[PDB]
């Protein structure tokens, strides 16, 4: 079987620059009679079906933008993007179309670099309806920030809590290139009423001091 | 432009399932069908190919004992049969159809298969109003199974400044949340409602965000 090796696995670039990713095969993909290399490139945007970009190592399918170029022969191939845009955010895959099995490479994830942006933090106490059910979730939203690296801690009455937390991140926005995060702390209605101060504390590159949002249960 | 694939499947461990792909707009005898698997957050994996000229199928050795591809030319439908399902089979399966006369590759939207013994549960929806310039509101959808649920704000009218986060599974139940940011003049003067629908349980619910 032919092994397809792609590199790098992740790539962060700024709008307008030239990008280059590599795909190597353990054996030649060249057909001597036709003089063509059967290597195919695909693009998969977040939450979408893959899309074929180039076949025969360098032939673009109709409709594919001119900034996408493919080259190489034998065992070494490359995909280049001249002037990467915000919508080029996706994972790129190469595939063997020379012989069975038609194996795919592991892919190269492309992310965009933009100016640092501080997260907008909001905290939300449990809704009365959830409390009636004997449950209590505290939500903290951290929207539109960059870079992706961020750390969130939950403090209840000043003490850190490491249980009942559930985090979730969105993909990089295809327009403003930012990330957003959601963190939910779930407790029982009883456990919730035993404490008073609830704090969502975030640490991000854009600030020397931790960004804090908080509320007191017994108040309104 | 895009092939049709069957809806989402929830199947228990050990059972089998049959997915379909209909090539609307093309005579299936002129299309080269390929089936591709993709586990959550992992890469694409080639399963096999169906030859339109003779009905013969070729597979990747690692899928030989699990998958079987067949076709029904009369209805333009190709099938993928998976047997003895395990948690390694939970993934999205894509139907790929190449039409060589146009030198074009067409893909279906994919069919999501979840292998689990967990039961279908309707969600509990909770409105999130600010703590007692701009104001951010939210909506919490907790304890549902399986995916997906669709959430909109004001029936879809409100679409800017919206962030819907990917659902996270924990102990056979998903939790999803969404935030919407509007100007302080818009709320609470004008009502904002969170609309949620869960196809699997045939339930819907509207929650109006009111001040505490």
């Amino acid at each position: 079987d032919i092994v397809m090796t792609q590199s790098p696995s992740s790539l962060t670039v700024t709008t307008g620059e030239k990008v280059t990713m590599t795909c190597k095969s353990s054996q030649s993909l060249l057909n001597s009679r036709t003089q063509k290399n059967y290597l195919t490139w695909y693009q998969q945007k977040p939450g979408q079906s893959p899309k074929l970009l180039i076949y025969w190592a360098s032939t673009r399918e109709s409709g594919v933008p001119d900034r996408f170029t493919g080259s190489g022969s034998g065992t070494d191939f490359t995909l280049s993007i001249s002037g990467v845009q915000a919508e080029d955010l996706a994972v790129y895959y190469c595939q063997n179309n020379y012989n069975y099995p038609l194996t795919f490479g592991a892919g190269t994830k492309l992310e965009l670099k933009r100016a640092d942006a501080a997260p907008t933090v909001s905290i939300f106490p449990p809704s009365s309806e959830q409390l009636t059910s004997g449950g209590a979730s505290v939500v903290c939203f951290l929207n539109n920030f960059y870079p992706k690296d961020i750390n969130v801690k939950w403090k209840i009455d000043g003490s850190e809590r490491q249980n009942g937390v559930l985090n979730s991140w969105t993909d990089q926005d295809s327009k403003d290139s930012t990330y957003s995060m959601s963190s939910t702390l779930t407790l029982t209605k009883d456990e919730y009423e035993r404490h008073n101060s609830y704090t969502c504390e975030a640490t991000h590159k854009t600030s020397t001091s931790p960004i804090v949002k908080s509320f007191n249960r017994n108040e309104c | 432009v895009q092939l049709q694939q069957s809806g989402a499947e929830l199947v228990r461990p050990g059972a089998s399932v049959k997915l379909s792909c209909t090539t609307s707009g093309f005579n299936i005898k002129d299309i080269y069908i390929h089936w591709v698997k993709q586990r959550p957050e992992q890469g694409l994996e080639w399963i096999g190919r169906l030859d339109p000229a003779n009905g013969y199928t070729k597979y990747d050795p690692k899928f030989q004992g699990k998958a079987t591809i067949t076709v029904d030319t009369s209805s333009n439908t190709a099938y993928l049969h998976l047997s003895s399902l395990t948690s390694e089979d939970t993934a999205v399966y894509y139907c790929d159809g190449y039409y060589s006369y146009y030198d074009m590759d067409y893909w279906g939207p994919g069919t999501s298969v979840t292998v689990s013994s967990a039961k279908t549960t309707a969600p509990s929806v909770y409105p999130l109003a600010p703590v007692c310039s701009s104001v951010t509101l939210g909506c919490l959808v907790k304890g549902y199974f399986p995916e997906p649920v669709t959430l909109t704000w004001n029936s879809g009218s409100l679409s800017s400044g919206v962030h819907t986060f990917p659902a996270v599974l924990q102990s056979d139940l998903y939790t999803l949340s969404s935030s919407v940011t509007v100007t302080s003049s818009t709320w609470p003067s004008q009502s904002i409602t969170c609309n949620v629908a869960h196809p699997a349980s045939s339930t819907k619910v509207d929650k109006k965000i009111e001040p505490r």
Partner: peptide, 15 residues
């Protein structure tokens, strides 16, 4: 049927 364009013609058809 015309051979699958992106694929190596020597593989077609499936024996």
């Amino acid at each position: 049927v015309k051979a699958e364009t992106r694929l190596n013609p020597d593989l077609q058809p499936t024996e």
